[PDB]
JTO light chain (Homo sapiens), 430 residues
Amino acid sequence: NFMLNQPHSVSESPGKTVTISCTRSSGNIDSNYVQWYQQRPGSAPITVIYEDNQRPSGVPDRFAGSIDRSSNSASLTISGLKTEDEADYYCQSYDARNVVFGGGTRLTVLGQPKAAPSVTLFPPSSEELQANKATLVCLISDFYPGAVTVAWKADSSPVKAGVETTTPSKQSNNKYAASSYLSLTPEQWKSHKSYSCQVTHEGSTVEKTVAPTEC
Amino acid sequence: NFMLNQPHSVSESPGKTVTISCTRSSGNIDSNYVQWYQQRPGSAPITVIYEDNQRPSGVPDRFAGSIDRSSNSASLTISGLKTEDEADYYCQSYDARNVVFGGGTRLTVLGQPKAAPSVTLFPPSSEELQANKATLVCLISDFYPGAVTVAWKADSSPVKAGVETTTPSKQSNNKYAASSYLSLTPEQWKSHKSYSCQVTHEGSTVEKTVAPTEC
Ligand SMILES: CCN(CC)c1ccc2c(C)c(CCN3C(=O)NC4(CCN(C(=O)c5cnc[nH]5)CC4)C3=O)c(=O)oc2c1
């Protein structure tokens, strides 16, 4: 029982080389075969690497797998990037009876310039508090590529309960927007000194914080 | 080298049984194990069956896998169809020289009940006003089907500039969420008595109103 940790995203221009790392949390990376899967948006998954570095028939030489024992990491390298390489890439392995997939890496083959998001965090409105709702909204606009990861904190502690995040959406300026909202009760909201919204984009992380007031 | 062929789509009504076939193109279906994965749009896939007919820990017992040796096919059978079962389903087997996936079957669950949206309108945050921004956000959640019209008002008049609405995305309750945001300056925000977000869904309107803080 172990995790495989991949970064959330990578991006490059057509024709360049990109590397996707996959770090095993406990145990040796070399003691079990590592596979790589590609899933293009709205497509079936395809195996691009099995047994660490083996390509199935039809998978071009541009895809290369490797293992690094000292890092305890596997890597998928894609050279001569093409637009059709734009996909989610997952590593998986085993130990004992456990099958383990990594969390996935979104690879974007850049189709326009990179744009860091505007992150605005809204505390509960008066209208919803009178309805025993303390829902928070994290608004994320004007970003590219259209992939983000959102994490919420109550004080310092992570929150998984009550989190919904929209699929990013192309807006009229041709950049992506999304919202994350946290469905709190006024009780939970007033019982903490602050809440935070963490937005990660192109491996850059921004944190916004709000505290209960009165007014 | 073999392939797995699944229907592109199946639609069925709630409480009824649906089958999804997965045909192996060469060799015997019984010579390697078959997995089934479920994928909701937006999310990573989830394992529903391994070793032909085994369910992992989270998975409703309404999900059953089977092997038919004569037709050289695997089947996923979902009894008592729930709207939460609407998703893409992929079968998967092994070729020793590959991990093979089917093309995917899109499962539509028909006659989903209507659900009016929860609407919440947030005035500008303190933090954004300190950075000379007065963006307003209207969270629109828990609605079905997944289309809304959003109109904004300054006092009682239609707003014609600065409105973005995101494409509704299905959330973890299998209902849609979106947010509409209006990018005002501090001046526009305080030059008016109020702003309003008007949401229409299935011929029914909801209108929320907010006004500059008095503190
Ligand atoms: C596109 C690549 N792909 C194939 C469709 C992925 C890509 C990613 C996943 C993930 C994230 C999970 C969910 C998390 N998860 C694991 O990492 N391992 C298991 C552990 C439990 N389990 C088993 O006990 C099992 C036994 N034999 C196979 N699976 C299912 C896999 C799991 O639930 C998963 O179950 O399946 C995945 C499949």
